[PDB]
C-alpha cells in the first residue's frame, strides 16, 4: 500500500483538533524495506506512562472493479 498512500495524519486524543495535529516526518530506517514516518510527541513519554494517538490514512485506487466490465443493467 505504501505506493498508494495519499495522506497520513496523526493527532492526540483531544478537542484542539486544529492544534493537536502532531508533526510527522517521512523517515528511512536502516536496512528495512518500506516507507516509515517519525512522529514527534508533544511531551515525552516516561517509563510506565501512556498516551492515546489516532492515526488517519487514505489509500487510492485500492478498490478494483471485479468484474472489470458490465452492461448498463449490471451492478458494480
Amino acid at each position: 500500500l505504501e505506493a498508494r498512500l495519499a495522506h497520513l495524519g496523526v493527532q492526540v486524543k483531544g478537542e484542539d483538533e486544529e492544534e493537536n495535529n502532531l508533526e510527522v516526518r517521512e523517515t528511512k530506517i536502516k536496512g528495512k524495506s518500506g516507507r516509515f514516518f517519525t512522529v514527534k510527541l508533544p511531551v515525552a513519554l516516561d517509563p510506565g506512562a501512556k498516551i492515546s494517538v489516532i492515526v488517519e490514512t487514505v489509500y487510492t485506487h485500492v478498490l478494483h472493479p471485479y468484474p472489470t466490465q458490465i452492461t448498463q443493467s449490471e451492478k458494480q
Binding site: 471485479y66 468484474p67 472489470t68 466490465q69
Partner: protein
C-alpha cells in the same frame, strides 16, 4: 509456451468414460494439461465466474446429454469460443439436441438422433452386423500435416454420426470426409427422403478456425477415441482386403489434440518496420514514386519455443482500396523484407500482410501510410530545353538597363 493454458475441463456423460478412454487422457496429461472430470449433468458446472474464464480448454465427451448443468449453455459455450478458448466435441448416435444446436452455431450440422454413417463397402469385419463401423481410408484425410500429423497412417476406424459442413461458411475445415459410397440415414428405415449427407460430402471429423483464431473440432464418434479402437486391428470385410496390425486411430487422435490445443501451426507477428531506402527511420509521409523498404518478422511456436518462421510464400500488398502492388517478401537477414518503388498515385495507402494458409494461424498486419505529392521545391529546375526562355528574361532585363542608361543621358 502453450498458446492456451493447461487448464482443461472434461465433461463426461458417465464416469466409466474415464476408464474406457484412459490411454487418451494419459496421452494428454503427459503433455502437462491439468484435467478435471465432471459429470455433464452436475449443477456445479460453470465456465465464467465474475467475467473471467475458469478453464482454457473444454472437452465435451457428453454425447447423450439433453442439457448441461449449471450455467453452461450453447450461448455460454459460444461466448467461450468468442473468448478464444479451444473446444473438442465428440458426438454419437445418442447425439442430444444441445450438441446439434452447438454445431448449428458453429455451422456444422449433425444429422438426427439414431442416425449413423453407413458404408456397405468399407464396413469393418468386426462390425456388429449393421455396416456402421466404417474403415475410413486415409486417402480422404485432409492434406494438411499441421492438422493430421506429418507421418503416414494406417486406416482409421469410425462409428458415429455424419455431419455436413454448410457451404455458406468459408472457414470450415473438412478434415475427414466419408467415402464416396458412405451416407447417413436411419439404418433400419427405408430411404423415403433424400439423405442428409451422401457420398464424399459426409464429414466424419470437421474443424473450425475462428477469426479470433479459436479452434473447434467436432468428431462424429466418441468410440473413435476409445482404447478399443486404439488397440484393435483393422481389415475391410470385403475379400481381397489386407489386415493391418494396428489402426492409425492413435496417432491421428494425438495430432488432432495437438492442433486443437495450439501445439502446432501457431504463428506470431513481431515488429514491422518501413523506411526510405538508405534512411534508418520512417518519414511522416512518403512522396510519389519514392523508394521504400518494408521489413517484418514472423515467428513460429515449435515444441513450445518461438522460432523464426520458415514459410516461403508470404506476400506483401500495397493497398488504397484495391491493391496497387503485390509481391513476395524475400527471406533475408532473419526477416521478411522487400524493396519497391511506391506507385505514381498519392493517398492514404496501407501495407498489408495476409498470410492465410490451411491449418496455420491467420496472420494479419496493417500499417497506414500516407503518400503525398511532390513539394514545390522538388520540381525539376534548369531544364535545358528551356534555356531559350531563361535567356529571354536575361536579355530583356539587360536591354531595359542599357535603355535606361541611354535614354536619360542622350
Amino acid at each position: 509456451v502453450c498458446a492456451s493454458g493447461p487448464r482443461t475441463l472434461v465433461l463426461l456423460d458417465n464416469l466409466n468414460v474415464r476408464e474406457t478412454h484412459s490411454l487418451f487422457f494419459r496421452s494428454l496429461k503427459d503433455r502437462g494439461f491439468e484435467l478435471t472430470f465432471k459429470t455433464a449433468d452436475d449443477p456445479s458446472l460453470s465456465l465464467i465466474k465474475y467475467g473471467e474464464f475458469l478453464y482454457d480448454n473444454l472437452i465435451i465427451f457428453s454425447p447423450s446429454v439433453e442439457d448441461f448443468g449449471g450455467n453452461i449453455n450453447v450461448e455460454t459455450i459460444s461466448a467461450f469460443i468468442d473468448g478464444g478458448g479451444s473446444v473438442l466435441v465428440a458426438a454419437s448416435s445418442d447425439i442430444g439436441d444441445p450438441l446439434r444446436e452447438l454445431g448449428s452455431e458453429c455451422g456444422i450440422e449433425f444429422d438426427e438422433e439414431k442416425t449413423a454413417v453407413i458404408d456397405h463397402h468399407n464396413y469393418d469385419i468386426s462390425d456388429l452386423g449393421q455396416h456402421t463401423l466404417i474403415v475410413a481410408d486415409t486417402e480422404n484425410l485432409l492434406k494438411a500435416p499441421t492438422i493430421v500429423g506429418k507421418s503416414s497412417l494406417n486406416p482409421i476406424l469410425f462409428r458415429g454420426v455424419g455431419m455436413v459442413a454448410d457451404p455458406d461458411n468459408p472457414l470450415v475445415l473438412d478434415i475427414l470426409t466419408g467415402s464416396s459410397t458412405s451416407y447417413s440415414f436411419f439404418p433400419d428405415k427405408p430411404i423415403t427422403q433424400y439423405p442428409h449427407a451422401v457420398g464424399k460430402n459426409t464429414l466424419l471429423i470437421a474443424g473450425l478456425q475462428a477469426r479470433n483464431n479459436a479452434r473447434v473440432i467436432f468428431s462424429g464418434s466418441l468410440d473413435f477415441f476409445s482404447d478399443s479402437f486404439f488397440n484393435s486391428a483393422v481389415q475391410k470385410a470385403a475379400p481381397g482386403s489386407q489386415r493391418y496390425s494396428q489402426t492409425g486411430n492413435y496417432e491421428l487422435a494425438v495430432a488432432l489434440s495437438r492442433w486443437v490445443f495450439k501445439e502446432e501451426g501457431v504463428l506470431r507477428v513481431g515488429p514491422v518496420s518501413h523506411h526510405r531506402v538508405g534512411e534508418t527511420a520512417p518519414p511522416n509521409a512518403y512522396t510519389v514514386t519514392d523508394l521504400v523498404e518494408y521489413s517484418i518478422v514472423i515467428q513460429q511456436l515449435s515444441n513450445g519455443k518461438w522460432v523464426p518462421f520458415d514459410g516461403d510464400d508470404i506476400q506483401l500488398e500495397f493497398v488504397r482500396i484495391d491493391p496497387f502492388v503485390r509481391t513476395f517478401l524475400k527471406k533475408k537477414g532473419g526477416k521478411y523484407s522487400v524493396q519497391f518503388k511506391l506507385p505514381d498515385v498519392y493517398g492514404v495507402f496501407q501495407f498489408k500482410v495476409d498470410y492465410n494458409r490451411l491449418g496455420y494461424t491467420h496472420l494479419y498486419s496493417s500499417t497506414q501510410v500516407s503518400v503525398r505529392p511532390l513539394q514545390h521545391t522538388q520540381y525539376e529546375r534548369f531544364i535545358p530545353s528551356a534555356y531559350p526562355y531563361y535567356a529571354s528574361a536575361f536579355s530583356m532585363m539587360l536591354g531595359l538597363f542599357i535603355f535606361s542608361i541611354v535614354f536619360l543621358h542622350m
